Design a protein around this ligand. Structure first.
Ligand SMILES: O=c1oc2c(O)c(O)cc3c(=O)oc4c(O)c(O)cc1c4c23
Ligand SMILES: O=c1oc2c(O)c(O)cc3c(=O)oc4c(O)c(O)cc1c4c23
Ligand SMILES: *Cc1c(COP(=O)(O)O)cnc(C)c1O
Ligand SMILES: *Cc1c(COP(=O)(O)O)cnc(C)c1O
Lengths: 810, 810
């Protein structure tokens, strides 16, 4: 149908149809008379999968022959979403499959909706890992993603009576056609036990053994015939485990619980034993696999020349003492040599500065679970602090501040300090964040080893986040500038030449209108809720957190409502305000915020005086596949975290690529986005980091804002008095109390500037031509935020490898 | 290579090779350079599976069009063994696959050894279900096997220091290519809750829900293109189950434990709650599936014309009150009509008379777990006893004896009494067993309803138990009489014409020698143990139980040893005595018996005076695939249960078909075997049932035998004094004590006759020609013991359907 979706040659279409029918018959054991649409989805998935396998085998064979340096990306989260369309895009099969299925009497878009998301992540950090795998394959790197195959990913969110309910995400129920179990490469992982000292060093003995069984998923590059591997570990009990009889068999679940469920915490540390087991499990199985692959090529001097290990946050930080354990206890290298190898192999990416997110494991936990690793951590600490003492003699407070061991009520290990000591590179995820790391939380470490500290600004893959989710926009762009931008996003800069082109203006605006109608239709059919498609689509989608300030958005919504009620017959730009995202099940305030959003909706959406001028929708079950629908439909992107709290953001970049304008603070990657587009083409408001610091030194007093802003006072009075909860007048007392007395994120301090900035948005939206021109300026300068740029920087500045755009033979 | 293994046409061989390479590449994602022999096994399995699917789809389509009466065989056990070779045999693919794999540079026999047994049964009852599925498919019946997909089947048995150790049988570790998950036909099963009475009858409410997910395995008939289904249920928690968050997800295992593990009890009732859950789970999911299939054709009058339900033992007895529950509570039929339908639908097979095997469930268990079923059982009981009272007025003891409710310390439900009341047919499994049922344990029921009581003598499938495991014997038979006997075993009677044929005598004896050499080679390569292939192979393989009297065999072994030690330079016929079988983990006496066998081996096998004249081997991990190896190698089959205890036996029949002579008591099917072959062609010894009864009335006194038989006294003195356990002299005190003071099975009473009978065996073995002639007379009269005969009798006399030998189109 459309050019970016590839060729539909008669030979290819015929072959796809034959293979579809073969899988339906032989693989699924169905005929056309009994087949459900789910069976048709599976027949298509297996047909497309067949096209991957040749390239997958040849890619891995190629890496064996050429022996390049291998990149190992260690993450506890891979937020993959659906695989079918992404695979078709990267293999240039989309139009052919569309044609083949049409001829079989089927709608491919309908079949695509049947696939479950691989929801093996929480939010930004998890989705970053997924975008990165796509870029690494596209750039021809010998890269492997290593993680856990969770049986249950991020919970499915249902809204009942305005409240979040959690349901198990049983994503493997119907099978996963993309994975290949590899039980032949099963590896043992050890837990508990004790340390024995011989004349030949330490021995870790009397351990409990859990098996790690790998499952491999293909990761296709964009049209280069490269197919890399994501290897995810599943926990299995040994067959003599606990071996009255019946109970011993049932107790196998105790071992296998390690890979059962993703911890649903986003930017929050929960110090639970099962989480620690997951962290060690992924690390121990991965490192054995790495060493096995290295040895098939006892000289560990060349180890850092053949292996890079990237730690996604501190979650796999145990890689550092585990590598030391293997090199020293098993391979019998001396400490200093092993340490040199370790440091040169490992690199660490920090994702947040929020104190409650930092992993600080109780010593007593590590002592029981991982007694040898604790000894190694103590030894690392002693040697590191000796270096600190020599560099800064007599500075006793620095010693205390930099220690990997934290003193207190409970002794803890600071995993971030372990990662810095044991890595040759430490990076933040946006320029402002990397600067904050050097100035504040890691200042001491930066003074000791300035060379370790880098920036690598986050990015997103333009495959999933443009071509896949917004084919209409990808096409109108391709018509003018060709197809090369899909793997070289900087080429979007050529679009600045069309900012005064009347044909292009009309096409950009038409693509947006079509996306909005399609999403408006989606909401009716699937959620029985009506929206006006002519309204400004005002969208905030991301995990629910106090720092992200969904509450500030709520205050604006209520302000707009109060202004309409005060002057009903005055013209206002119509808005659909959409907020979506999950709260961690134990995060009470975030759960209260969701209830507030729905309660506001209950009032606003049913008030006849408002009409269709304002609508407030909570988008249920926000996840990757929902993002692919809502982002192309958005006019306004809400990126309103308190300055200095959102390390980068990536949702911000997705909206910019897809033709929404941004209202945002100077936080995270927003700063770089505004710098790329021009500040005049962005809706910037609020305190800068420096303003927040100044307010903190003086002391934040919320009462002052309440006293001075009559519109703010009225909202607080409405909240307190039960206006939004008539049957439970004090329902929102916790929210009011937090805002008035202990708001860490200074919601009130940005309220006035935010409301005023929102008026400027409404003014611009009244002039469609000028709105669209600003949109064009945003799309045209979004090139920097491709994860291809990010990965090329990691490859050159951290991993010491050259990216390649060259095709492997088909 | 050999004719019974089918054609190896050039077209077929070429096609098999192409498909093998396709599966290796696309299915397994391997090339020839990285492929293990396990990968080659899987490539072959998928290739053969492809040939089933067309016939499977067409068979099920055929049953939809024709709408025949459907047979539902309900069993908690399906002891299937391996599937690859059986599938090739039934599809006439064996030679072609052999050729195709040879050409690819592979040994097919080696690949066959890689397949795990589907060990979803304990012994006789489980293997009977498997033989039956094979016969039902071969006879063209519209039959479905329904059971549980256990994650762990019967434990793997290891022998450590002479003791049984149990290991989890993780048979699904590498995947199962034969099954097809059918998550689309998932059904809810209810547990716990309470009964509510409305104006519209009873309601079962506040239940806990567990999902039943079916997996279908194809069951191919012998060369008739019929492929039936075995449907096995897996337990799944609902997604809102227990829905802090993490724990609620982990607690899903509580529901899914239902299908986790097979109870390893053979002919022994253990009244555990989890076992009861398994029994209801299979019944509730199966009956919903039955009713769904029936309705796709509210007139339940025709229900018994379209449905037969066969209960394999009392394990699925809850089918009776469950059918009543559905018909009365859900479909709103009146009681009497529902009861008529139920009785006409259900039939019950009894497998043992041993009191400790009978299921007698505590009322308090049923009250908590299944409150509505208990109410229904009480109502059945009241109405049944009203009929008893009317037929036998004033006979108050009969009322007590026949009640489904047992009075006592704990009130219990007798499941056998429930099955008789609720079935139109009740059968035993051999003529003597069916007579014992009428005379003793079910005498009262037989007097009330004589017409219900039938015999159906057990059988075995000649596909697995001749063609598959003994191709050499199948071939020499086919050379003389053709191939028709494979599905018409009565034709073996034609072999009586060759009893004086010198060529045939030599061929029969040669096939046995070849089988013995192959098994002798197997024992060395796999278990590092040497045996003399010229010795008489004396084999007792079956579950370890006191009733089966492995102990009597032990006494004979020790007697032979003592006789050699007394007269070393006297000639004796050399023997290899092989005993194998598993003991239930909690069965202490059976575990002690295994230890005795190995301890005897330790003495006998290392005594230089004995030489290679006597060897005692315990065959580890006896299971279906081991049976297929050892049975063709046997000379003498030990079938030595106390008269009246072994209901039928089926191992006995397997040995007869494969050219072993039988030493046995007049018990179970041994009686019919001796009747078929002629008593002169059998080695019969010992008490008859009548002799056991006489001894019981007088009182069994073991001391008497000890006092009168000096050879017996010496063995007991050796056991007591530590001769077979020098480092633990009293190790076998439990065994000695049981034999002397509380032997339920009268081991000593048969000792003298058994030893004398064994001398007659040794005498005949000295004359190879006459041994082989007797063998021919056994093989030639084994036809009655085909499960095809058994199933034809079930079909005609119980299910009311006609078997068909006619082929479906290919
Ligand atoms: O008790 C909690 O307090 C919190 C906070 O005070 C906060 O600011 C953020 C969070 C957060 O992100 O995730 C959480 C969880 O997954 C959880 O199980 C418990 C809590 C939080 C939490
Ligand atoms: O405690 C037991 O006593 C038994 C007997 O006394 C017996 O004659 C036969 C048996 C038997 O066959 O299986 C068993 C089990 O699976 C189990 O867990 C416990 C027992 C038995 C058992
Ligand atoms: C991109 C993305 C995120 C991250 O969004 P931010 O606004 O950067 O927090 C979270 N969840 C999903 C499903 C995403 O696609
Ligand atoms: C046939 C068979 C049995 C039953 O043997 P009996 O001697 O009749 O008890 C038990 N186990 C296996 C593995 C079998 O093949």
């Amino acid at each position: 149908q459309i050019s970016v979706r590839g060729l539909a040659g008669v030979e290819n279409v015929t072959e796809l149809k034959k293979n579809f029918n073969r899988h339906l018959h032989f693989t699924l054991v169905k005929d056309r008379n009994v087949a459900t649409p789910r069976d048709y989805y599976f027949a298509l998935a297996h047909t497309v999968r067949d096209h991957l396998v040749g390239r997958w085998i040849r890619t891995q064979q190629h890496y064996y022959e050429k022996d390049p340096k291998r990149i190992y990306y260690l993450s506890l989260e891979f937020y993959m979403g659906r695989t079918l369309q992404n695979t078709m895009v990267n293999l240039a099969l989309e139009n052919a499959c569309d044609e083949a299925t049409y001829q079989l009497g089927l709608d491919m878009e309908e079949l695509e909706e049947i696939e479950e998301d691989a929801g093996l992540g929480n939010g930004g950090l998890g989705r970053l890992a997924a975008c990165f795998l796509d870029s690494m394959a596209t750039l021809g790197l010998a890269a492997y993603g290593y993680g856990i195959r969770y049986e249950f990913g991020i919970f499915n969110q249902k809204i009942c009576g305005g409240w979040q309910m959690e349901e198990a995400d049983d994503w493997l129920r119907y099978g996963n056609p993309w994975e290949k179990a590899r039980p032949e490469f099963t590896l043992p992982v050890h837990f508990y036990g004790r340390v024995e000292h011989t004349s030949q060093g330490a021995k870790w003995v009397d351990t409990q053994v859990v098996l790690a069984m790998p499952y491999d998923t293909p990761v296709p590059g964009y049209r280069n015939n490269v197919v890399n591997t994501m290897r995810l570990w599943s926990a299995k009990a040994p067959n003599d485990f606990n071996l009255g009889y019946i109970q011993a068999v049932l107790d196998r679940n105790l071992a296998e619980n390690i890979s059962r469920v993703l911890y649903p915490n986003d930017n929050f540390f929960e110090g639970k034993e099962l989480r620690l087991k997951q962290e060690y499990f992924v690390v121990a199985a991965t490192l054995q696999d790495i060493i096995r692959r290295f040895k098939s090529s006892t000289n560990f001097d060349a180890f850092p020349d053949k292996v890079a290990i990237q730690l996604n946050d501190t979650h796999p930080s145990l890689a550092i003492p585990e590598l030391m354990r293997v090199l020293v206890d098993l391979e019998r290298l001396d400490w200093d040599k092993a340490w040199e190898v370790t440091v040169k192999t490992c690199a660490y990416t920090n994702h947040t500065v929020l104190p409650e997110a930092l992993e600080r494991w109780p010593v007593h936990l590590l002592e029981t679970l991982l007694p040898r690793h604790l000894q190694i951590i103590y030894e690392i600490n002693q040697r590191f602090l000796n270096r600190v003492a020599a560099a800064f003699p007599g500075d006793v407070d620095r010693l205390r501040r930099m220690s990997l061991v934290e003193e207190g009520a409970v002794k803890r290990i600071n995993m971030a300090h372990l990662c810095i000591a044991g890595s040759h590179a430490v990076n933040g995820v946006a320029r402002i964040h990397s600067e904050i790391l050097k100035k504040t939380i890691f200042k001491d470490f930066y003074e000791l080893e300035p060379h370790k500290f880098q920036n690598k600004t986050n990015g997103i893959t333009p495959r999933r986040w443009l071509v896949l989710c917004n084919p209409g926009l990808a096409e109108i762009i391709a018509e003018r500038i060709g197809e090369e931008y899909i793997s070289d996003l900087d080429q979007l800069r050529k679009l600045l030449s069309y900012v005064d082109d009347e044909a292009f203006i009309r096409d950009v605006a038409k693509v947006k209108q079509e996306n909005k109608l399609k999403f408006a239709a989606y909401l009716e059919r699937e959620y029985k809720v009506h929206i006006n498609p002519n309204s400004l689509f005002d969208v905030q989608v991301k995990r629910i957190h106090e720092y992200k300030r969904q509450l500030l958005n709520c205050l604006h919504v209520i302000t707009l409502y109060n202004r309409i009620k005060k002057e009903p017959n005055k013209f206002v730009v119509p808005r659909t305000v959409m907020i979506g995202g999950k709260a961690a099940p134990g995060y009470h305030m975030a759960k209260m915020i969701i209830k507030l959003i729905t309660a506001i909706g209950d009032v606003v959406n049913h008030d006849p005086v408002v009409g269709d001028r304002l609508r407030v929708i909570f988008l249920e079950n926000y996840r990757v596949s929902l993002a692919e629908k809502v982002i192309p439909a958005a006019d306004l992107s809400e990126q309103i975290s308190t300055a200095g709290t959102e390390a980068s953001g990536t949702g911000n970049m997705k909206f910019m690529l897809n033709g929404a304008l941004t209202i945002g603070t100077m936080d995270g990657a927003n700063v770089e986005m505004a710098e790329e587009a021009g500040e005049e083409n962005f809706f910037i408001f609020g305190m800068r980091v420096e303003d927040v610091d100044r307010l903190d030194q003086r002391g934040y007093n919320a009462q002052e804002y309440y006293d001075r802003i009559p519109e703010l006072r009225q909202i607080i009075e409405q909240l307190s008095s039960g206006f939004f909860s008539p049957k439970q007048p004090d329902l929102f007392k916790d929210i009011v109390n937090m805002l008035m007395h202990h708001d860490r994120f200074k919601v009130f301090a940005d309220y006035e500037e935010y409301v005023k900035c929102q008026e400027r948005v409404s003014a611009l939206y009244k002039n469609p031509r000028e709105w669209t021109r600003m949109v064009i300026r945003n799309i045209a300068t979004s090139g920097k935020f491709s994860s291809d740029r990010t990965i090329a920087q990691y490859a050159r500045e951290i991993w010491g490898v050259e990216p390649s755009r060259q095709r492997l033979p088909a």
